[PDB]
C-alpha cells in the first residue's frame, strides 16, 4: 500500500493510486512540514510530527492550491452509513472512512519488543473496498494491512468517542475540479519556502525545550506519543530520498544523515518510555540540534534544487 507520511495522507494516496487520480501522490510525497502543540502535549494527544490530525488540513489546502483537488468531509448516522457506503462503492469503488483504531490494531508491536500494547480510542483511516451482509473488507494503508471486520465492529468503530473527538461515520471524498499538473521541483520549492517562512524548524526547538522540562515528570507516555508522532517526519525524509532517486534531484548531501538523526531521536524516546534509560537532557539536546540542521538543510534545498 501507499505509505504517505501519516494515516490521512496514506488513505488519500492509496485511494489515488488504486483509481490513478493524478497529482495526489506527488503532492503527498513532496510534503515538508513540522508542527508542535503544547496543549496537545499535556493532554497526551498526537502533539508533534509532520501535521496536526486526524485530518491533515494543510495537505487539503495543498491539494486545492496546486491541483484544484478538493477533499469533502461527509458525516452520517447509524441508520444511513452502510446504505450510503453501498452507493459510494457503486459510484467510486472505494470509501475513505474515519475509524477508531481501538478496533483495528493493524501494527505488530511485538516485532519491536512491546508486548504491553495499551488499548486506546484514537481516530485512524481505512479504505472500505467491499460491503457484505455481516462483514466488510478494509485496507489500513498506513500499516500495509487489510482485514475482514464484522459489520458490528465496523459500525461501532465509526461511531466511537476517541481522545481526539467523536466519530460519526465520517467519510472523505476526493474530487478533481480540473487537475493542474506540477513539476516535483515546484512542489518541493513551495514546501521548503513555506517551511522557512512559517519557521517550522522553530516548532522542533519548542518540542526540544518541552522534552528538557520532563526531567522529573513521573509519567513517560509523552515519550511513546512523541515516538509515534515522529514516524511522519521519518516518512517525509524517506519520501524526499525516494523523490531524489526517482527524479535525480539536487539535494544537500546530509539528507540521509538527517533521517538517521530523527531515527536516533525516535529510538531514544522509545528507550526512555520503555524504562531502558533516564536521558531527557540527551533527547532534548538531539532535538534542538536537529532543529538547526533542518533549518540549514531547508535553506540549502532552496539554493540547489
Ligand atoms: C493513524 O491515524 C493512526 C492512528 C492511531 C494509531 O495508533 C496509529 C495510526
Count Cβ atoms below 10 Å from residue 205 Cβ, excluding itself: 18
Contact between 184 and 274 (Cβ < 8 Å): no
Backbone angles phi, psi at 105, to 5 degrees: 45, 55
Q: Is 68 helix (H, G, I), strand (E, B) or coil?
A: coil
Q: Do residues 118 and 222 share a domain?
A: no
Residue among 232, 164, 222 at smallest CA distance from 8: 232
Unique residue bearing C-alpha cell 478533481 = 176
**Residue 276 in domain:** yes
Q: Is 58 helix (H, G, I), strand (E, B) or coil?
A: helix
Own/partner pairs, 135-138, CB within 8 angstroms, 24+ separation: 136/85, 138/97, 138/99, 138/104
What is the number of domains present in the chain? Answer: 2
Domain limit, last residue, from 176, 201, 235 = 176
Domain limit, last residue, from 137, 152, 176 = 176
Q: Do residues 13 and 161 share a domain?
A: yes
Own/partner pairs, 264-269, CB within 8 angstroms, 24+ separation: 265/230, 265/290, 266/227, 266/230, 266/231, 266/234, 269/223, 269/224, 269/226, 269/227, 269/230
C-alpha to C-alpha distance for 267 and 95, rounded to whole angstroms: 35
C-alpha to C-alpha distance for 70 and 32, rounded to whole angstroms: 20
Q: Do residues 192 and 144 share a domain?
A: no
Q: How big is the CA angle at 75 (ends 92 and 10), to the nearest 5 degrees?
A: 55
Backbone angles phi, psi at 36, to 5 degrees: -150, 130
Count Cβ atoms below 10 Å from residue 67 Cβ, excluding itself: 22
Residue among 82, 114, 122 at smallest CA distance from 98: 122
Q: Do residues 172 and 109 share a domain?
A: yes
Ligand 1 neighbourhood includes 55 CB (under 6 angstroms): no
**Residue 46 in domain:** no
Ligand 1 neighbourhood includes 142 CB (under 6 angstroms): yes
Q: Do residues 119 and 196 share a domain?
A: no
C-alpha to C-alpha distance for 287 and 266, rounded to whole angstroms: 10
C-alpha to C-alpha distance for 36 and 265, rounded to whole angstroms: 16
Ligand 1 neighbourhood includes 141 CB (under 6 angstroms): no
**CB under 8 Å to 265, separation ≥6 — which residues?**
230, 283, 286, 287, 290
Resolution in Å equals 1.7
Q: Which three cell numbers stand for residue 76?
A: 452520517
Q: How far is the CA of 192 from the centre of ligand 1 (A)?
A: 26
Contact between 13 and 19 (Cβ < 8 Å): no
Q: Do residues 17 and 151 share a domain?
A: yes
Q: Which three cell numbers stand for residue 268?
A: 531514544
Residue among 13, 277, 270, 267 at smallest CA distance from 139: 13
**CB under 8 Å to 220, separation ≥6 — which residues?**
272, 273, 275
Q: Do residues 198 and 232 share a domain?
A: yes
Domain containing residue 200? 184-304
Q: How far is the CA of 57 from the centre of ligand 1 (A)?
A: 17
Q: Would you mind telling me the total number of residues written for the chain in this entry?
A: 305
Strands 69-74 and 48-49: unpaired
Domain limit, last residue, from 176, 198, 213 = 176
Q: Do residues 127 and 11 share a domain?
A: yes
The experimental method is X-ray
Amino acid at each position: 500500500t501507499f505509505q504517505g507520511y501519516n494515516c490521512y495522507s496514506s488513505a488519500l494516496g492509496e485511494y489515488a493510486k488504486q483509481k490513478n487520480i493524478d497529482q495526489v501522490e506527488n503532492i503527498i510525497l513532496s510534503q515538508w512540514s513540522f508542527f508542535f502543540d503544547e496543549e496537545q502535549f499535556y493532554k497526551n494527544q498526537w502533539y508533534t510530527g509532520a501535521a496536526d490530525g486526524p485530518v491533515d488540513v494543510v495537505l487539503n489546502e495543498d491539494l486545492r492550491n496546486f491541483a484544484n483537488i478538493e477533499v469533502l468531509e461527509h458525516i452520517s448516522s447509524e441508520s444511513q452509513a452502510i446504505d450510503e457506503g453501498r452507493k459510494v462503492l457503486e459510484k467510486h469503488g472505494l470509501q475513505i472512512v474515519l475509524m477508531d483504531f481501538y478496533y483495528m490494531n493493524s501494527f505488530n508491536w511485538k516485532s519491536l519488543s512491546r508486548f504491553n500494547v495499551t488499548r486506546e480510542h484514537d481516530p485512524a483511516f481505512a479504505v472500505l473496498t467491499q460491503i457484505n451482509e455481516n462483514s466488510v473488507h478494509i485496507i489500513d494503508p498506513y500499516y500495509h494491512h487489510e482485514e475482514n471486520m464484522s459489520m458490528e465492529d465496523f459500525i461501532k468503530s465509526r461511531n466511537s468517542m476517541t481522545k481526539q473527538g467523536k466519530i460519526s461515520f465520517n467519510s472523505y471524498e476526493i474530487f478533481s475540479n480540473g487537475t493542474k499538473k506540477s513539476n516535483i521541483k515546484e512542489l518541493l520549492y513551495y514546501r521548503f519556502n513555506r517551511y522557512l517562512q512559517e519557521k517550522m524548524f522553530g516548532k522542533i526547538t519548542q518540542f526540544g525545550q518541552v522534552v528538557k522540562k520532563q526531567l522529573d515528570n513521573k509519567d513517560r507516555k509523552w515519550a511513546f506519543t512523541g515516538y509515534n508522532c515522529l514516524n511522519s517526519v521519518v516518512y517525509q525524509h524517506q519520501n524526499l530520498i525516494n523523490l531524489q532517486k526517482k527524479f535525480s534531484l539536487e539535494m544537500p548531501p546530509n539528507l540521509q544523515e538527517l533521517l538517521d538523526n530523527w531515527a536516533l531521536i525516535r529510538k531514544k524516546l522509545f528507550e526512555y518510555y520503555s524504562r531502558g534509560s533516564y536521558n531527557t537532557e540527551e533527547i532534548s539536546n538531539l532535538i534542538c540540534k536537529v532543529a538547526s540542521s533542518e533549518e540549514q538543510f531547508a535553506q540549502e534545498v532552496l539554493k540547489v534544487l
